[PDB]
Amino acid sequence: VQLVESGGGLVQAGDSLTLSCAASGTFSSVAMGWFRQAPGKERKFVANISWNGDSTYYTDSVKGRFTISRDNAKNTVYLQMSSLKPEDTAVYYCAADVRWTGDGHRADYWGQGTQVTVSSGDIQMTQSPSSLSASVGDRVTITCRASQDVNTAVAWYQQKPGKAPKLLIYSASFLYSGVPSRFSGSRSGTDFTLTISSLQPEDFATYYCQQHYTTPPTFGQGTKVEIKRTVAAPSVFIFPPSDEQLKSGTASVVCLLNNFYPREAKVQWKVDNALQSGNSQESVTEQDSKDSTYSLSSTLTLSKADYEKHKVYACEVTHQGLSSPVTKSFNRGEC
Amino acid sequence: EVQLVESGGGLVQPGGSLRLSCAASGFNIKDTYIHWVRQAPGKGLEWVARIYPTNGYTRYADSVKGRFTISADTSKNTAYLQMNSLRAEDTAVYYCSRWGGDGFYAMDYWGQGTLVTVSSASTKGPSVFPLAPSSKSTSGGTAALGCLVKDYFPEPVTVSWNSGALTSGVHTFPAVLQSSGLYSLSSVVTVPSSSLGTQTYICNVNHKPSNTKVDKRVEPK
């Protein structure tokens, strides 16, 4: 892969130059951009064009004067420069897979440069669907409609359990630095789509679109994406009360149902073959970022005294991954 | 590298006041807009407020207008959210984020979050008991063990294993609300059968709202 720039020249102030960049290696799936550099000074970003051309963005100093175009059929990215000031005198570089970093821009591929000398003499984002569930390597789409035009002031954020929202897509179709290439953004007026092409067990999250076109910046309903896996039975374990808990007036008896799929499991407590009701509490974990499984804890909370009344303390589990119900138990007083 | 760290969440009496801090490292707050964004439990994202630390120009969501005040201190490179006239609809995890970009804005960097509970009720440190590994908690070379974190208020408690050396096969369950009105949660870990007896297992419970830090050691039956 090589990017070759062509079109640089000597120009007087207020003239207009077009720079072409021939990309040979494909380029139609990645963001193309232009950087510029004055010798002795660090390389600085100029403009960017998203893979499909939906959106562009320009460094403040060139906005209104420069225009970034792109031909996916001709393998070219252009920069139409206008009303050129002498401060635009630099080496113009063309780059491939140009992404914001938090400190500046980065790129995968770079051109060799072409010298350019300028000689002085309330909005709502309606997200769809709210819930989504698909198998690994399936293409998923989250469509989010703005109430009025917001242009390309739209960002896509993924949020996983426990943690803070993470930036995936910016300016409707641009990928942030780090984000895998399976996520693509698209704009069509007020309609903004996010596409995860090859869904992965680590794409389990809630995704939100957000408009910062006006105050207030507003978020969408979100989309909880569930990753489907193969039917997997739970590993059932039984945990009696500690002696520490028994010194007080209570006894909690936890039944662990580790790593199962789908989430629907049934748990029944039995105390001396006597089925229990309204004395147990459930909690299910959030699906795994690695193996797409769920886990569940049914706690049977009784008094110190009642625990001393009965013998056997059984937990009975029912699931898709099982041909028959799993019972795990213990007798109080036995080692 | 840019980093936003938050401090000052927790329990606050209704009507009362709580000031959240957002410490920034790896950039100047004078260059960008700093925001506060919240999330009600199991709900979506709500933009709260914003500041341009240079001139101090703020903007709020009608929902927090007249009640909350966003302010910054450049000398310290910290932004703040002073919450007053606290209602129950304000119970949420509060994130701060900035707007970074070149010829665009996007919340590239965020804070870690801090849960604010608006309640009249009183703080209570948890009671940690081991969920000791047994032969009735073993299945084909994989032994399960855990920790019970009963009777604490408000949320949250954070469980780590062996000071964070043990992360694989850990499952710290969401908390359950009891009849008492206090929370209780378990945290389990599945370790190989060969490791029990030869390797030490400790769960590190931290209830920040009542400054509780308990390191219960889980030994077999």
CSV table of C-alpha atoms in Angstrom, one decimal, chain A residues 45 57-60 100-103 105 122 157 159 162-165 167 170-171 176 208 210 212 215-217 219 235-240 242 244-245 250 252 254 256 258-259 281-285 288 295-297 299 301 328-330 334, chain B residues 1-2 26 35 37 39 43-47 50 59 62 95 98-112 129-134 136-139 142-146 148 150 171-174 176-178 186 188 190 216:
chain,number,residue,atom,x,y,z
A,45,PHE,CA,-3.8,17.7,10.8
A,57,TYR,CA,-14.3,17.9,9.1
A,58,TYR,CA,-11.6,20.7,8.8
A,59,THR,CA,-9.1,22.2,11.2
A,60,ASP,CA,-10.4,25.6,12.3
A,100,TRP,CA,-8.8,11.3,16.3
A,101,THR,CA,-6.6,10.2,19.3
A,102,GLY,CA,-7.4,12.7,22.2
A,103,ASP,CA,-4.0,14.5,21.5
A,105,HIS,CA,-4.7,12.5,14.7
A,122,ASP,CA,-35.3,20.6,22.1
A,157,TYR,CA,-20.9,5.3,22.4
A,159,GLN,CA,-21.2,1.2,27.5
A,162,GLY,CA,-19.9,-1.4,35.7
A,163,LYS,CA,-17.8,0.9,33.5
A,164,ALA,CA,-18.2,4.5,31.8
A,165,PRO,CA,-19.3,5.1,28.2
A,167,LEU,CA,-16.4,6.6,22.2
A,170,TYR,CA,-17.5,10.5,15.9
A,171,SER,CA,-18.9,13.1,13.5
A,176,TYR,CA,-12.0,6.8,17.0
A,208,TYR,CA,-26.2,5.2,22.5
A,210,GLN,CA,-25.8,11.4,20.9
A,212,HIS,CA,-24.2,17.8,20.4
A,215,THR,CA,-27.7,22.6,24.0
A,216,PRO,CA,-28.6,20.3,25.5
A,217,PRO,CA,-26.6,17.5,23.9
A,219,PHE,CA,-28.9,10.8,24.1
A,235,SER,CA,-22.3,-25.7,36.9
A,236,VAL,CA,-24.4,-25.8,40.2
A,237,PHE,CA,-22.6,-25.4,43.6
A,238,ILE,CA,-24.0,-25.4,47.1
A,239,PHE,CA,-22.7,-23.1,50.0
A,240,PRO,CA,-23.9,-23.6,53.6
A,242,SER,CA,-20.5,-20.0,57.9
A,244,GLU,CA,-19.5,-16.5,61.7
A,245,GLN,CA,-23.1,-15.9,60.4
A,250,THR,CA,-29.3,-15.6,60.7
A,252,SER,CA,-27.9,-17.5,54.5
A,254,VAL,CA,-26.3,-19.7,48.6
A,256,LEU,CA,-24.4,-20.8,42.7
A,258,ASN,CA,-22.2,-20.8,37.2
A,259,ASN,CA,-21.8,-19.9,33.5
A,281,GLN,CA,-33.6,-14.0,46.8
A,282,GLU,CA,-32.2,-14.1,43.2
A,283,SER,CA,-29.5,-12.2,41.4
A,284,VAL,CA,-28.2,-12.9,37.8
A,285,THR,CA,-24.9,-11.4,36.4
A,288,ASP,CA,-19.7,-12.3,29.8
A,295,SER,CA,-24.4,-16.8,36.3
A,296,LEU,CA,-27.0,-16.9,39.1
A,297,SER,CA,-27.2,-16.8,42.9
A,299,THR,CA,-29.8,-17.1,48.6
A,301,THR,CA,-32.1,-16.6,54.2
A,328,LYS,CA,-27.1,-30.1,45.0
A,329,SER,CA,-27.3,-30.5,48.8
A,330,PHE,CA,-25.7,-31.0,52.2
A,334,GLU,CA,-21.8,-33.5,58.5
B,1,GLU,CA,-2.5,10.5,28.1
B,2,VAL,CA,-5.7,12.3,29.1
B,26,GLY,CA,-2.7,15.0,30.7
B,35,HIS,CA,-19.4,18.2,31.2
B,37,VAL,CA,-23.5,13.3,32.4
B,39,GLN,CA,-27.3,7.7,34.5
B,43,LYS,CA,-31.7,3.9,32.8
B,44,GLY,CA,-30.1,5.8,29.9
B,45,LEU,CA,-27.6,8.7,29.7
B,46,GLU,CA,-28.6,12.3,30.7
B,47,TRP,CA,-26.5,15.4,30.0
B,50,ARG,CA,-21.2,22.0,31.1
B,59,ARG,CA,-25.0,25.8,30.6
B,62,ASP,CA,-33.7,22.5,32.9
B,95,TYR,CA,-19.8,10.9,35.1
B,98,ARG,CA,-14.7,16.5,28.1
B,99,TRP,CA,-15.2,17.5,24.5
B,100,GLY,CA,-12.1,16.8,22.6
B,101,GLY,CA,-11.4,17.2,18.9
B,102,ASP,CA,-10.0,19.1,15.9
B,103,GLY,CA,-12.7,20.6,13.8
B,104,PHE,CA,-15.3,18.6,15.7
B,105,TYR,CA,-16.5,17.8,19.4
B,106,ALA,CA,-16.7,14.3,20.9
B,107,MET,CA,-16.6,13.0,24.5
B,108,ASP,CA,-13.4,11.0,24.0
B,109,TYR,CA,-12.5,10.9,27.6
B,110,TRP,CA,-14.8,10.3,30.6
B,111,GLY,CA,-14.6,9.9,34.4
B,112,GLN,CA,-14.9,6.5,36.1
B,129,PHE,CA,-18.7,-14.1,55.5
B,130,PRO,CA,-16.8,-16.7,53.4
B,131,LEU,CA,-18.6,-19.0,51.0
B,132,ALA,CA,-16.1,-21.8,51.7
B,133,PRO,CA,-15.1,-24.3,49.0
B,134,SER,CA,-16.5,-27.8,49.7
B,136,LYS,CA,-20.5,-30.1,47.3
B,137,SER,CA,-19.0,-27.0,45.6
B,138,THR,CA,-16.6,-29.1,43.3
B,139,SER,CA,-17.3,-30.5,39.7
B,142,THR,CA,-13.2,-26.8,39.1
B,143,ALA,CA,-13.8,-25.6,42.7
B,144,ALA,CA,-16.1,-22.6,43.3
B,145,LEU,CA,-15.7,-20.3,46.3
B,146,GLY,CA,-16.9,-16.8,47.3
B,148,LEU,CA,-21.2,-13.0,51.1
B,150,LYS,CA,-24.7,-8.9,53.7
B,171,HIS,CA,-18.5,-13.0,39.3
B,172,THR,CA,-19.5,-10.2,41.8
B,173,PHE,CA,-23.3,-10.4,41.5
B,174,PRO,CA,-25.5,-7.2,41.3
B,176,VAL,CA,-30.3,-7.6,46.0
B,177,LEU,CA,-32.6,-5.3,48.1
B,178,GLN,CA,-33.8,-7.1,51.2
B,186,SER,CA,-22.2,-12.3,46.7
B,188,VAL,CA,-17.8,-15.9,43.6
B,190,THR,CA,-14.0,-20.6,40.3
B,216,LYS,CA,-12.2,-11.9,54.6
